[PDB]
Amino acid sequence: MKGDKKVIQHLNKILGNELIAINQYFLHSRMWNDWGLKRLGAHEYHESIDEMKHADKLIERILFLEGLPNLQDLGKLLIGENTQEMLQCDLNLELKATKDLREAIVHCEQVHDYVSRDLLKDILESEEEHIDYLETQLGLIQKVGLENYLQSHMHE
Amino acid sequence: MKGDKKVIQHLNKILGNELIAINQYFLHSRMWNDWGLKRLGAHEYHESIDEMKHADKLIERILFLEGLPNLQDLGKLLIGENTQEMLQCDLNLELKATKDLREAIVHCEQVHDYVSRDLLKDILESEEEHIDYLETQLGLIQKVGLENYLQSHMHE
Amino acid sequence: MKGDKKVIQHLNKILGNELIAINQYFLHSRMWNDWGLKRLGAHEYHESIDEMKHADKLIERILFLEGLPNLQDLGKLLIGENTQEMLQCDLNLELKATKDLREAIVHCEQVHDYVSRDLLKDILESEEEHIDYLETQLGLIQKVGLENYLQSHMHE
Amino acid sequence: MKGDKKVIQHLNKILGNELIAINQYFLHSRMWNDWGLKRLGAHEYHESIDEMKHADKLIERILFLEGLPNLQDLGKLLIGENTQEMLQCDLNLELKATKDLREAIVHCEQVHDYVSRDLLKDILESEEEHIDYLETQLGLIQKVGLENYLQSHMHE
Amino acid sequence: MKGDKKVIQHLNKILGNELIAINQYFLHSRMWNDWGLKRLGAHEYHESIDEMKHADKLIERILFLEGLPNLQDLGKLLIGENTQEMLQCDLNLELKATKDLREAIVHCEQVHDYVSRDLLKDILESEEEHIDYLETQLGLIQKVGLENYLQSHMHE
Amino acid sequence: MKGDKKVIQHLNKILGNELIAINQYFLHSRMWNDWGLKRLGAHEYHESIDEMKHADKLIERILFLEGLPNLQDLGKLLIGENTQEMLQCDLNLELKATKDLREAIVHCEQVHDYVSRDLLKDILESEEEHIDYLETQLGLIQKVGLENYLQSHMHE
Amino acid sequence: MKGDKKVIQHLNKILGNELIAINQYFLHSRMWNDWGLKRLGAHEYHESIDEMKHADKLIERILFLEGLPNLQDLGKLLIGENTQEMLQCDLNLELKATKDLREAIVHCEQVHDYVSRDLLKDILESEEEHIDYLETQLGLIQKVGLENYLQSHMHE
Numbered sequence A, B, C, D, E, F, G: 001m002k003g004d005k006k007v008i009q010h011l012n013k014i015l016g017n018e019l020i021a022i023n024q025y026f027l028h029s030r031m032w033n034d035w036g037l038k039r040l041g042a043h044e045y046h047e048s049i050d051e052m053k054h055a056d057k058l059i060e061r062i063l064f065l066e067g068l069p070n071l072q073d074l075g076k077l078l079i080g081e082n083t084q085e086m087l088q089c090d091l092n093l094e095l096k097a098t099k100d101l102r103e104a105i106v107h108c109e110q111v112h113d114y115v116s117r118d119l120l121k122d123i124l125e126s127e128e129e130h131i132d133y134l135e136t137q138l139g140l141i142q143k144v145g146l147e148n149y150l151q152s153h154m155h156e
């Protein structure tokens, strides 16, 4: 079904953000596992899987709309050097992602691609849940202290 | 069965205390969940449910006695800004509630409404258990420190 | 995540309507149980519970958006004195509620808070189901007559 | 297998009657559900389903006989405005349907299409069962009164 | 609940499209079964049932909105004479349907009937999945050849 | 445990090849699904998953050896435009991957990193199995013909 | 089967390293248990058991190759006096063990004793996993502090 060219560009932009997040979250997960912070590693792994599933759905929608999904261009990963930075890098990436999602929904609405809009709204709900998680982790580091926060994430 | 006018007024005052407690505990629960302190959130949620069940029983007794349950007037909620204040706000509310329960029981006894007295005694037992929980949490904060106390309440 | 100030005001207004509905439906439920109309009592109880669930989700969203949920201000309860009037009071409240939901959705769309819109849309679907139920009950009273209508609601 | 031309015309006529009945019974069903008369709504829904199944077999038989099933022409639906009228409308349609079935059976018998006759006899048995049901409901309205009759069809 | 007159007209227009599709897909299904292409027949049958379910929900929504569902007017069925043409007829009908769904959604949005919009969006998702299925079948015919395509749809 | 610098460089090169393959195979999988060639789509999905698992193990080994896994640099994806070309693109990528694997094993052996060698040997076994599959598919296209080969991969 | 004299000497040297580790890890395990650090005790016990299993396989291989396993000469145990020292003593022993394993693998390769090489590679994989565990624990002590690290290892 021939899609709107600019819808497809927006979907490829969202997909590109998901592709960054897959790799960024997967590396952060394995860094935390390597450091013995296995509960953080496990949760970050599941965040990475979630982005993989979003990327899948975007690829499928783009192809149905007779566009070419862009898996070639990989933007800049934000890799932290400690737990606090890794969580902040994730949150900064999510805030860009949700900004881009909102602009994509605007355009979908304007050209009446309501199914693409519904897909993006669902992805936006997942990303806002991830923002909730990240903001809460940063708040907990303040409320329980870094040593306790890391201690609470050693064992699964 | 027509009840004593002043019993019904006492029952409505106790009900009013329960209605404040429902909302105060429900908001505190959701604040704690938002902050990532999910074990505190779950326990405060169950305290809110407790008060909902007491309010139900009070409403049922008032109606049986052919009075009008007052769900319209809501007294002042005591909302804290941090964990220790939220617990102390709960405790201050509970101490007012048990004072009001005692005066209501005196009057039920004087006019021989022994069934209303028994209901209020059951509610008073529950409220004294809540006071025990609150005093104990405040004592634990002193013994283990706030950061450890909150750490122990991150995960359900 | 910092929310739009007027979105949060709209959410608190929707929350206020739900808080009214919780108490109005809970009291109507217990009135119907006291009168021996237990099927009405049980159905109205479940309506109250549904409103409690909506209020929970609104509270949770407001906190995520870094607003202050308002559980203190309680608007006017519409309490009926007989079955037809109670249903009509519920219906009047619901029509006020869906008017407010539509205006809140308009504003969420305008500021691109698509997740808040989706939450409100889900709530609007529930409230329109309640309107469907209420309009149908009032119509049944006209079709089968009040005495038969009440008879049919004595037993669950 | 090449069928008799007039058998196919008769089969298309019976099918045309079933297609009217499908839509008339389905709309009456949903009207009754909208009005809270859910036992009538459910029963009328099953009548519509039964006509769908008859239409299926008629379509299958026409095609085996190398005819063209006519799903394009839709005759006049008889939609009532209240329960008595709706039941009488169904009954008027069923009486036309059974007249047409009898004439189709005569013709199948004359050209020795005994399998088509057997199919139509089975459909006629179902339509006479529907007639019994309809006549009985109209009779019950007279015996128990309209208000009781409707009351008895509120709950499934 | 009194709905917008033009929303109801749009809903009846969508319903009219579903009613055409029910009959067109059902006949196509039974043609394919008669020709021994049972996997096509079964899939097309399930497409017809899906349109029946959409029509039900549209009828129910119209009645809730106090309009009159139109099951009387049946538009033009597009019946093919061979497998390729039947698939193209279905696809042509689906493209008209999704064009009409988009216009109805625009109008629901403008009058703030967000629940009708959500229903139509769900139907639109279903119809776009049908378009994907249809476009894919036509493409497979080109890739594997017509004889192989039919061969693969002989047995379920 | 501090690893050999050039081993880590080799591991990152193997990792880089796996990251290309993940995306290349995932996109090919979703293209085949879009085209209705669901058995190829499923098999190619499992190949993509297999490469994801290899990438995970390389990332973990690199971090253990105190290197920085490179998920940022993504080399050139080889995306075909039809089935035969997609298989060949997978095959060309795999032939480069196994050459690089052999060179990495040589160097691991030279510096006595026998665990890294064993990991690379296991990955090489998986890549050679993938080569067996790909060569066999390309040969089957020749033996049964393209139209039959595609037909045989339509349904899972 | 007569083995290479120097392979057997290498195998007896690896065996000697394993025998030290059995006793060192078993004593550390029981010290931690006596101190109430039962999770460290349990983990260290399983490390000791693992070395016992390695020693068993080495003894079996030496006898198959017609050498004499040396269980008489026991090298120097590295027993720490506190948790940090005990972990570092384990790590120092493992680093010596993996150096000796690498030299033995070199010699097995030169004389084509590929089965002995495979046995040693498997032991080396297990010892590098122990190195990973030990390095991670020492890092966790720095990240969460010694008191939290010990607290997390009180209960199994």
Ligand code: HEM
Pocket (backbone or CB within 6 Å): B019, B022, B023, B026, B049, B052, B053, B055, B056, B071, C019, C022, C023, C026, C049, C052, C053, C055, C056, C059
């Ligand atoms: C007049 C005030 C209220 C009364 C009388 C009341 C009564 C009740 C009762 C009797 C239950 C069932 C508990 C059980 O036996 O399991 C319940 C459940 C619940 N209430 Fe309330 N309640 C009130 C207010 C509220 C408010 C203000 C909120 C939230 C803001 C709330 C949230 C809930 C929730 C989330 C549940 C659990 C529902 C479920 O999933 O089953 N309630 N309430």
Ligand code: HEM
Pocket (backbone or CB within 6 Å): D019, D022, D023, D026, D049, D052, D053, D055, D056, D071, E019, E022, E023, E026, E049, E052, E053, E055, E056, E059
């Ligand atoms: C040419 C007209 C039609 C034919 C031949 C037809 C045929 C059928 C058949 C064979 C079934 C399944 C019966 C079974 O379960 O054994 C069915 C189910 C159904 N039909 Fe129809 N039908 C037609 C029109 C309609 C229309 C116009 C509507 C609604 C407005 C409708 C609504 C339904 C529904 C809701 C179901 C149940 C699907 C489910 O299982 O959930 N049908 N139909």
Ligand code: HEM
Pocket (backbone or CB within 6 Å): A019, A022, A023, A026, A049, A052, A053, A055, A056, A059, F019, F022, F023, F026, F049, F052, F053, F055, F056, F071
């Ligand atoms: C550095 C890149 C990636 C790595 C390391 C990686 C790793 C993984 C791993 C370890 C799994 C679990 C496999 C198992 O079941 O054991 C997985 C699953 C999966 N991956 Fe990835 N992956 C990557 C990229 C991607 C991309 C780019 C996509 C799609 C665009 C994707 C889609 C999926 C899906 C759909 C699943 C299964 C999810 C489910 O359980 O439903 N992955 N990945």
Ligand SMILES: O=C1NC(=O)c2c(NCc3ccccc3O)cccc21
Pocket (backbone or CB within 6 Å): A068, A069, A070, A071, A072, A073, F027, F077, F078, F079, F080, F081
């Ligand atoms: O990242 C990428 N996403 C893609 O589609 C893609 C490529 N596609 C080649 C191609 C072109 C025109 C039509 C069909 C096609 O398969 C080629 C390279 C990279 C990518």
Ligand SMILES: O=C1NC(=O)c2c(NCc3ccccc3O)cccc21
Pocket (backbone or CB within 6 Å): D068, D069, D070, D071, D072, D073, E027, E077, E078, E079, E080, E081
């Ligand atoms: O309601 C209907 N039933 C049908 O068959 C039909 C149509 N069929 C076209 C056609 C003609 C001649 C031969 C094979 C054919 O498919 C066309 C329109 C409507 C209908």
Ligand SMILES: O=C1NC(=O)c2c(NCc3ccccc3O)cccc21
Pocket (backbone or CB within 6 Å): D027, D077, D078, D079, D080, D081, E068, E069, E070, E071, E072, E073
């Ligand atoms: O397809 C149809 N949908 C309908 O409602 C309908 C008819 N309705 C009769 C009627 C009119 C005015 C007011 C209430 C009513 O029941 C009559 C014929 C056909 C249809």
Ligand SMILES: O=C1NC(=O)c2c(NCc3ccccc3O)cccc21
Pocket (backbone or CB within 6 Å): A027, A077, A078, A079, A080, A081, F068, F069, F070, F071, F072, F073
């Ligand atoms: O693809 C990547 N793999 C990585 O490690 C990485 C980055 N690492 C930052 C960094 C440097 C020095 C020390 C610790 C560190 O976390 C930064 C960007 C991209 C990548």
Ligand SMILES: O=C1NC(=O)c2c(NCc3ccccc3O)cccc21
Pocket (backbone or CB within 6 Å): G068, G069, G070, G071, G072, G073
């Ligand atoms: O630690 C030890 N390992 C051994 O084999 C061993 C002894 N072996 C006695 C013996 C000698 C000559 C030939 C065959 C034999 O069994 C004796 C003492 C200690 C050990």
Ligand SMILES: [Fe+2]
Pocket (backbone or CB within 6 Å): A148, A151, B148, B151, G148, G151
């Ligand atoms: Fe602690």
